[PDB]
Amino acid sequence: MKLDMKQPRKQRKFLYNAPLHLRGKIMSAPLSKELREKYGVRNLPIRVGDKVKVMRGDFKGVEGKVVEVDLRRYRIHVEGVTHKKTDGTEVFYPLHPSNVMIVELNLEDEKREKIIERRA
Template identity: 40%
Template sequence: MKPTKMRNKMIYRASYQTKSKQLGSALSKDLHKKYGKRSVRVIEGDSVTILRGEFKGVDGKVAEVSTDKSSVAI
């Protein structure tokens, strides 16, 4: 089986705990220095900046986090 197919299969069959870990986001340089971590899980109320895609540069707060869909609403 191709590695990409295996990876997609693992993502699709992932447990809620694993899916939750996949909803992480990189921290800003200030927060990285303060907490000593590069990324943390996103929760409701977090302030975020979109860095890629159609909405690049948009700032906002996280309104909803869905582990079922592996998505974050801002």
């Protein structure tokens, strides 16, 4: 996407009122070296069914799996990453995919494969 503006307010406004076909890109995450030297790609947009390693936060180290993506808030959910309520019931803790590394890809769709052979 063309974003050529040295005005913070225009930047932030774009980020807030961006259309939905461009939010997946902003939701990109990095890959592991073991997948980079295999596919030749440094980042990809995130997708449910992918396995994840948390590289930042209180759940630093945890390995998990993606079960929910929310574009309107720019967040994701990872099984294994939850806190308890005062009741005692467990609820997910929402993460940003800048703090997350992909360690196993879900490839049962031709369009992801086309993405890869585009950027390799």
